[PDB]
Design an enzyme around this catalytic site. Structure first.
Site, PDB file in Angstrom:
ATOM      1  CG  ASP A  15      -0.321  -0.305   2.412  1.00 31.37           C
ATOM      2  OD1 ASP A  15       0.681   0.279   2.672  1.00 31.37           O
ATOM      3  OD2 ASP A  15      -0.833  -0.584   3.684  1.00 31.37           O
ATOM      4  NE  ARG A  29      -0.338   3.018   4.545  1.00 29.43           N
ATOM      5  CZ  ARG A  29      -1.438   1.913   4.330  1.00 29.43           C
ATOM      6  NH1 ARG A  29      -2.466   2.838   3.089  1.00 29.43           N
ATOM      7  NH2 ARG A  29      -2.145   1.755   5.450  1.00 29.43           N
ATOM      8  CG  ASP A  34      -3.669  -1.948   6.757  1.00 26.73           C
ATOM      9  OD1 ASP A  34      -2.501  -1.654   7.018  1.00 26.73           O
ATOM     10  OD2 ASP A  34      -3.538  -3.099   7.597  1.00 26.73           O
ATOM     11  CB  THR A  35      -0.919  -4.285   1.373  1.00 30.22           C
ATOM     12  OG1 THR A  35      -0.350  -3.182   2.188  1.00 30.22           O
ATOM     13  CG2 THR A  35      -1.942  -3.321   1.033  1.00 30.22           C
ATOM     14  CD  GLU A  37       4.664  -2.943   7.464  1.00 38.27           C
ATOM     15  OE1 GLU A  37       5.791  -3.533   6.832  1.00 38.27           O
ATOM     16  OE2 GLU A  37       3.993  -1.834   7.134  1.00 38.27           O
ATOM     17  NE  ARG A  75       2.463   7.458   5.219  1.00 34.63           N
ATOM     18  CZ  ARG A  75       2.114   6.154   6.073  1.00 34.63           C
ATOM     19  NH1 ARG A  75       2.958   5.094   5.786  1.00 34.63           N
ATOM     20  NH2 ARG A  75       1.040   5.912   6.809  1.00 34.63           N
TER      21      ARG A  75
HETATM   22  C1  LIG Z   1      -3.873   5.499   5.160  1.00 33.40           C
HETATM   23  C2  LIG Z   1      -3.839   6.721   5.724  1.00 33.40           C
HETATM   24  C3  LIG Z   1      -2.915   6.077   6.909  1.00 33.40           C
HETATM   25  N1  LIG Z   1      -3.065   7.169   7.978  1.00 33.40           N
HETATM   26  C4  LIG Z   1      -2.035   7.651   9.454  1.00 33.40           C
HETATM   27  C5  LIG Z   1      -2.259   6.335  10.351  1.00 33.40           C
HETATM   28  C6  LIG Z   1      -1.475   5.321  10.903  1.00 33.40           C
HETATM   29  O1  LIG Z   1      -0.928   6.364  11.856  1.00 33.40           O
HETATM   30  P1  LIG Z   1      -0.634   5.658  13.191  1.00 33.40           P
HETATM   31  O2  LIG Z   1       1.015   5.123  12.491  1.00 33.40           O
HETATM   32  O3  LIG Z   1      -0.643   7.299  13.762  1.00 33.40           O
HETATM   33  O4  LIG Z   1      -0.525   5.079  13.659  1.00 33.40           O
HETATM   34  C7  LIG Z   1      -0.553   4.837   9.476  1.00 33.40           C
HETATM   35  C8  LIG Z   1      -0.644   3.611   9.192  1.00 33.40           C
HETATM   36  O5  LIG Z   1      -0.001   3.942   8.207  1.00 33.40           O
HETATM   37  P2  LIG Z   1       0.532   2.177   7.789  1.00 33.40           P
HETATM   38  O6  LIG Z   1      -0.315   0.939   7.074  1.00 33.40           O
HETATM   39  O7  LIG Z   1       1.595   2.559   6.178  1.00 33.40           O
HETATM   40  O8  LIG Z   1       1.677   2.503   8.931  1.00 33.40           O
HETATM   41  O9  LIG Z   1      -0.765   6.451   8.739  1.00 33.40           O
HETATM   42  C9  LIG Z   1      -3.555   8.821   7.862  1.00 33.40           C
HETATM   43  O10 LIG Z   1      -3.247   9.800   8.394  1.00 33.40           O
HETATM   44  N2  LIG Z   1      -3.799   8.499   6.481  1.00 33.40           N
HETATM   45  C10 LIG Z   1      -4.165   8.222   5.955  1.00 33.40           C
HETATM   46  O11 LIG Z   1      -5.027   8.525   4.702  1.00 33.40           O
HETATM   47 CA   LIG Z   2      -0.270  -1.191   5.505  1.00 33.57          CA
END
Ligand SMILES: Cc1cn([C@H]2C[C@H](OP(=O)(O)O)[C@@H](COP(=O)(O)O)O2)c(=O)[nH]c1=O
Ligand SMILES: [Ca+2]
Length: 130
Positions: A15, A29, A34-35, A37, A75
């Protein structure tokens, strides 16, 4: 919402993808999904799916939603298309991503992805096989 040219630097995982956006190397992103890890079950498969979908595309496109265009980590937040097919949607439809991180500012394609997820669940694909 409108699509625009995406200049691919490299795929990252299920993702996330690296694009050159306005001449800046930038992690994007995928919105609303959510894919796993890379090290988790279906992680290598999700990575491979997104990678090949974006790479093999003749036309790569990015589509921002109406709200936040970047997350707290710098991102980009977008929907990504490969020859007109949405990567976010295809991952969900194949059971390689869950609908996730649904924020009301950036939720244009929520119903579309929830439709795809219900079909993956019915078919017990990948993430939904156990
Ligand atoms: C998809 C997405 C993730 N995020 C944030 C939430 C998560 O933050 P926290 O780390 O504070 O929980 C993190 C998850 O990304 P990953 O799934 O890439 O790790 O990215 C956003 O803020 N907006 C979004 O649209
Ligand atoms: Ca992920």
């Amino acid at each position: 919402l409108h699509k625009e040219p995406a200049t691919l630097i490299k795929a990252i995982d299920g993702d996330t993808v690296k694009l050159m956006y306005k001449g800046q190397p930038m992690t994007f992103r995928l919105l609303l999904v959510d894919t796993p890890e890379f090290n988790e079950k279906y992680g290598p498969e999700a990575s491979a799916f997104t990678k090949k979908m974006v790479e093999n595309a003749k036309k790569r496109e990015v589509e921002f939603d109406k709200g936040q265009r970047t997350d707290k980590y710098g991102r980009g937040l977008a929907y990504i298309y490969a020859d007109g097919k949405m990567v976010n949607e295809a991952l969900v439809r194949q059971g390689l991503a869950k609908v996730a991180y649904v924020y009301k500012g950036n939720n244009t394609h929520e119903q579309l992805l929830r439709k795809a997820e219900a079909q993956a669940k019915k078919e017990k694909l990948n993430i939904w096989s156990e």
